[PDB]
Ligand binder design. Sequence first.
Ligand SMILES: C[S@@+](CC[C@H](N)C(=O)[O-])C[C@H]1O[C@@H](n2cnc3c(N)ncnc32)[C@H](O)[C@@H]1O
Ligand SMILES: C[S@@+](CC[C@H](N)C(=O)[O-])C[C@H]1O[C@@H](n2cnc3c(N)ncnc32)[C@H](O)[C@@H]1O
Lengths: 511, 511
Amino acid sequence: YESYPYAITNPYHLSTLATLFGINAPEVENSKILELGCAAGGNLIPHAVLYPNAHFVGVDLSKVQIDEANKNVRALGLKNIEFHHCSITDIDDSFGKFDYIICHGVISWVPKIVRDKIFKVCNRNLSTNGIAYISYNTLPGWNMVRTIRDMMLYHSSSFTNIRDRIAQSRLLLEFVKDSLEHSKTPYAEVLKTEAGLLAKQTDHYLRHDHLEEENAQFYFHEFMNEARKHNLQYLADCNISTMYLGNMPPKVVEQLKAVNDIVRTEQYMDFITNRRFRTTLLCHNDLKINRNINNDDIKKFNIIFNVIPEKPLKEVDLNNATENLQFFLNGNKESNLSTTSPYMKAILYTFSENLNNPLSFKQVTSEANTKLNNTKLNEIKNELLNNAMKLVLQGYISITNQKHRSKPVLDKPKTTQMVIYQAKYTPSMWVTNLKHEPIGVNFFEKFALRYMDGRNDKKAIIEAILGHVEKGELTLSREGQKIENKEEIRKELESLFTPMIEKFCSNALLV
Amino acid sequence: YESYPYAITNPYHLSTLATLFGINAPEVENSKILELGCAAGGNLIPHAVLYPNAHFVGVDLSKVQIDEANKNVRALGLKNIEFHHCSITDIDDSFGKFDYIICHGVISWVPKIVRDKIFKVCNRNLSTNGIAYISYNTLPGWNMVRTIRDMMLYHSSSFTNIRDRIAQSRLLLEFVKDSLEHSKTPYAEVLKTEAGLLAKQTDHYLRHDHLEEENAQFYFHEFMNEARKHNLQYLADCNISTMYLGNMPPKVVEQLKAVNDIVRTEQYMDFITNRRFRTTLLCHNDLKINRNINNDDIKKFNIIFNVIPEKPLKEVDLNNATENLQFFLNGNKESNLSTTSPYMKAILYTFSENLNNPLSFKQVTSEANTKLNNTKLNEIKNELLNNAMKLVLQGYISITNQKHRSKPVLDKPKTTQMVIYQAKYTPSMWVTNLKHEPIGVNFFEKFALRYMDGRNDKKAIIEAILGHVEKGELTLSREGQKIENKEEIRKELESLFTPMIEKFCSNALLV
Ligand SMILES: C[S@@+](CC[C@H](N)C(=O)[O-])C[C@H]1O[C@@H](n2cnc3c(N)ncnc32)[C@H](O)[C@@H]1O
Ligand SMILES: C[S@@+](CC[C@H](N)C(=O)[O-])C[C@H]1O[C@@H](n2cnc3c(N)ncnc32)[C@H](O)[C@@H]1O
């Protein structure tokens, strides 16, 4: 019962993935967004703060949460969002026509009647050019998760209390990690890791009630068949890399490319890759979508490539073409790309100081062009054009319709309204950034964001945080777990401050 | 659509696992054996030839098969066996009470009503000390088989031909064996193998009607649940090694040993080992079974350990404890065991000349004591006593209630009546041995067995086969590639003869 944002749900990501396929979706700046199964609305409210001219509606069956959502909407003072306590089946054509309909993690947990109704409202209540989003669990991938859920019910059947039946399942998952300690068999690998990721989870799914729930257990084509019954058509997935073919032998790529149905192509890919989950984008049946995508399409979007250089800029010469420089993707150990070309090296160093900041094609191109003394522009353009889209379809590069943001002022840092409201008034250990992603903080950053407005500067902010450490409410961790009253504060804050402002500036927490 | 014997179904194997657990099952020599879903009865008739004083009944729904069964029963002239074309549902209480009821690979393919009936007839028609056998596909193991079968139907629907849609799925399993050519991922392993053993299967399993069939998809505890409704109790599995614990951390063995339930012990092992199949032995609820098994219980049975030494006896000294001798189990490279102990060396060299010939504890012990110069009797006994049961519950050693057989006479070898009928009048490349196992023969072996009666000897048998090669009907080629004159044969017959009499003598094909 903690409401998280899901960045894959952002209406801007749907407008972008549509724009990539040829549909012009409504503008998000002023739109109608619907959320089926909202509450507590952490996937809705942060949008209503950033877009005051759009209209947000949300629907849920738990009154407990719909009241909490309204408790936050009342604290932030928003007029553009309203939450309704009712069921999806209660939505007629009078609700209006929405530009983006977001259904996340519900349609597989509800009875067939509610399913048919969701498929209806994604037709009756969807605009002419609008877009619908539905996430669900698929087969075969879910076969393992179902199995574990059965293995826990069969065990936890010997215990009754809701306080006894949970830690029990948590002890059965440990018992599984013990009996499989020494196993070569390739199956005990999947079971070992899936019980490790289920054991890491907390108490919500693990309640023996949620384990009794039956899942729609879709196959992608059964889902699409119920979708075409309602005159909807498959747009794309929200992870474009899941649609990536090849990374596959070329005779099979040719075969699949021969068949002209994308649905039984994605089905096959589901069968051979053991897909367990899908985030599907649906659009009205009357739209003509274009699947011929070429490198030159990279100019229609703004680009985000989060790469951390392996050596600082002033420490290298880009024209050294024998030097093989490598960059790490949001991280890292391994997960890296190495280039020896001066133009690709100039582009990645531009992407490495713009982290999580959309950049147009002329901004990436011109800003990489001044590291090369303004002479090499056409060679920069020619490498971006060539490798770009190819890297967008593999997932490494993110495209967006969101505009570039002005580099923040770090004199007196200033964060967004949503994260000051989450830092001051909220028990949660994470905040929502401008990209609609939850990012973690440890009580120090949270307290810092409490005081980060365009007013308090470095000194003032630290003295306030210190104010918290006295009444604390505030520990000092390090290596560590000790604080000496004076020598472990105000000399330990000035250390952690600069890099934390780094993390904020590069994670889109500063406006 | 070829009738095969299943050695794991032999009433003597059930009488043996029962004896092992404390139940005295009826004599197999004269009993009442039932088979649900028998025809064409290749799993029944070979028993009716060896036990003329026992009564065999079988039931099947295919007249096409019951006609063949009845024709083979007519060709052998058997009065002790009768086949009925009817349904399991057509069974009265008037059918009698059978000492062994054998249901192999049906209960998962039949509607819930027929399942109810099978569990019923395994109660009302089973004797007081009798035993029932039911094999079925289980979960989780079957999930993969379900996936693949769905993967074929969804594919093969684009054409409706019973002759097209088959070689179609045959080419889809190839499209699967290709697109996974280079893959590390362990799921592509499971899928790689499961499509490989499915493509090796031929034209029947793939019939696309039998892909349309739905499986009961049992869990062991759901099966034991329908068994206890009918007052049946779990006896054991016909693969004793599947009930073996550890191979498992001793804390996990202790934990399972704490809860006393055999059903949820086998259920948890089914969960962690991904059990796909079960051959279950059921017995009446009123019986007291003993699960305490001690090393010295190996004296109640007769022993078969098929080991092929790596060195001839005359080539080694058993008394040398510095020599590490290696033995191969039914084969082989790979599966083998090496021992340096002189007593285990005398026991394994005693089991290696008795292959597939049950041997009592005093025969193994007395014959292994004469290899050590008759000084070691109590040391041989104590090593058999110790390692025996431990190796029986692991699968390496076979126990049986069947008696030792008199060493056959190789002057004029004489094979059993069942394989003479199969050699002469059946176009099968395999015959059924005395242990009820199908064993292959190649065109030479078949022709040889045609003439093996207690009359024809070496020269005569060879002249007969030579006669065949003249009219042949028999192509004899060395590699070689077309021997073939006159005494380049009869010199190839005296060659192929001796190793074949060895092969027959140790496969229980010679009486
Ligand atoms: C299965 S939960 C998933 C919650 C959330 N989207 C997530 O995973 O983070 C679905 C949410 O939908 C709401 N819900 C369930 N059934 C509904 C229905 N029939 N009509 C409207 N809302 C419903 C519930 O309050 C529940 O919190
Ligand atoms: C899987 S095959 C049986 C295999 C069995 N393990 C054997 O080979 O001895 C299923 C056979 O069972 C028979 N059968 C199917 N349904 C039956 C029913 N309801 N009653 C009796 N026999 C049935 C059919 O004749 C079919 O040939």
